[model samples]
Target: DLKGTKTAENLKQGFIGESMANRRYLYFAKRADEEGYPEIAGLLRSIAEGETAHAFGHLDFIRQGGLTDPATDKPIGTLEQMIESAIAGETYEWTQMYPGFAKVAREEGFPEVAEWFETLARAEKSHAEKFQNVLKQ
Candidate 1:
């Protein structure tokens, strides 16, 4: 599975994105609540947890080493940027990453991760809708 240095490098960026996403969703959850969008807040909270799960998954493949904010020592990107980034990430994962993984998992006898990816994909669809609702507000 370990193809080249680029594979490891890509994974490093993936882990960073996932971790940043988790933190961003929690912020979304709080902002929704503070803005009086209670239902949206709950949905955001759920997705926040989902992002944490995704971060954990990436961490399984890559322990550390990636981008971070220069000042706060956190991952870079603002909350709005993160939300937009997630929409794009989810789109690409469903269209590209998950499909490739599913095929590889089956061929390599690791179907479980592929199955997990399917569920994660579904949750992301829900998050897309939630994001739409948030936008409407």
Candidate 2:
């Protein structure tokens, strides 16, 4: 059976990078809030949740045989790297993936799916903006 598994090396290396992003966003979210940047904080918090979602999603995907095996070698090198990854994913999914899905949904008469895709695409755009803002600051 072709079972997808995160390579031991990947697991060994990936978790720290993942953990760093999760924690960094979460931490900065707190700081942003404390610094009277509630909007920034809220966005950061949401993005943090998205990062967590992405991490779990990747895990689930791998668990369900999505990836043959992920390299656990902590492919991520820095906080910026992690944030950049999140930014890229959010941008791609919103600008590309979701739009394509939305188009298909509209063509197929899946109004609900189309609406949902549009909603998610907006959020994804915002997510990219959030990362960009944080990186700037």
Candidate 3:
């Protein structure tokens, strides 16, 4: 019932914010642990779990309003179709998105960031290949 409303937009924004916070907190937790702050890491991870729950709640509301794939403007299909979508997404990241990011990072004199993008591109390629293999079977 919230579809196409301002409330729906707000819900989507909330979902995005919560999802990012969840991951960001987890990343911070890892850094805390690496810096020998186990208590801080635990606290961050506990908050991350709360963020994850909030994200899930937002996603449920979004789904209740009928979510569709933005790329195709259609409901997500079967498992095979979902896998295909994953492959497509991974292939695009490795072949185009990450490569472009890497180029810009290098142009900006961020060699380490460029290398990180390159590494992610390679990882994305492997992910695409794994999805491709799944489709082949």
Candidate 4:
């Protein structure tokens, strides 16, 4: 049903966004538990579960078509080159993009947004490290 419909792209994006939100919520949940807030941590974990459900819903929609159709938009590179690109992108997000967004969020008095940006930046750093380690293998 979603093969070539407008819902296809929307569902695809939703899947991606929800997956990221799931990870972010899980990250925050771990931080909460470590910071001595078990209740908040549990809440975050539950929300993360919900996010996972949403992602799966979108995934199911797209599995039949929904932007997975053959296209020329896919990456074209060797495995090593792909890993290098991933590292570069992650490094840029952590070291440059997120920092600027965080600074702007702080200047705009959105401490929560700033905190999220900083935490995601840290996650991006971890991502870069993981990819770098992979490339070393």
Candidate 5:
């Protein structure tokens, strides 16, 4: 019954987004606390908790079986290959995906979302650089 439903796909997306938002907000909360903005930190922490709850709700839907896509067979790769994959993913997000998302957000009159996308892009770029450093070591 759930195998081919749009609701199933939407739930998966919601789960991924909420899970990611929780991590991002947690990072933001930490930075706010370090900057002595305790109120801001608390707000970020609360929002992150909400994201966690939403992620769990979405996860419950997916746990009903056949709600998720079929898994792909895996091939083992070296640690170097794994690092390269991560670097590539982060680079793609920074260079292509976020820019495209930001453009759409701006066109749709969601400037705040656009800013968020831009911010994420910047962060991804930094992450890519850090991964490169790790790879070189």
Candidate 6:
């Protein structure tokens, strides 16, 4: 019922932002722990969990029956099509986004952060492969 509306678009954007925030906070928490700030790490992780809840709430509002693509204002399509979309997204993270981030982190002298991005990039590659296998079935 909410498909293609501005409200739906807002919710989708909110979901994406909150999801990203959740991950970003967790990464910060890890760094805090590494720097011997366990209490700060705990606070960051707690906030990260709240961000995840916000993300889930936004997703729930966006998926009234099924998700609509904001750009196309159309239903996201069949299961295979969804899997294909996931593959494309994961592939981009591995092949472009994370690699670029890692390179920048390295140039900035954050070797550990660069390694973290590289690790996530590898994981994204595996995720893309998994989605590809699902689409193959």
Best by lDDT: 3
The most accurate candidate by TM-score is 3
Summing lDDT over every window of 10 consecutive residues in candidate 4, give the lowest-scoring window: 68-77
**Predicted structure 6: clash tally:** 0
Give the TM-score of each candidate: 0.42, 0.49, 0.76, 0.49, 0.49, 0.63
Q: 96 in model 4: Cα distance from truth in Å?
A: 20
RMSD of each: 13.2, 11.3, 2.9, 6.7, 7.7, 4.8
The weakest ten consecutive residues by lDDT in model 1 span 67-76
| Candidates sorted on lDDT, descending | 3, 6, 5, 4, 2, 1
Kindly give the number of clashing pairs for every candidate: 0, 8, 0, 0, 0, 0
Pick the winner on lDDT between candidates 5 and 6. 6
Residue 51 deviation, candidate 6, in Å?
0.8
Question: lDDT tens string, model 6, 22-77?
Answer: 99999999899899999999999999999999987775665554675432344445
- State residue 106's C-alpha deviation in candidate 6, in Å: 14
lDDT, candidate 1, 67-135, per-residue tens: 333212344245664455555656666666677777777788887987887777677667766765554
Q: What is the Cα-based lDDT of residue 128 in candidate 2? A: 87
Candidate 6: list runs displaced more than 4 Å.
Answer: 69-82, 91-126
lDDT of 4 by residue, 1-137 (tens): 55557777777778778888989999998999899999999999999999999987775555545244122222323577557767877888999999899999999999999999999999999999999999986
Residue 122 of model 2: what lDDT? 90
As for candidate 3, its clashing pairs are none
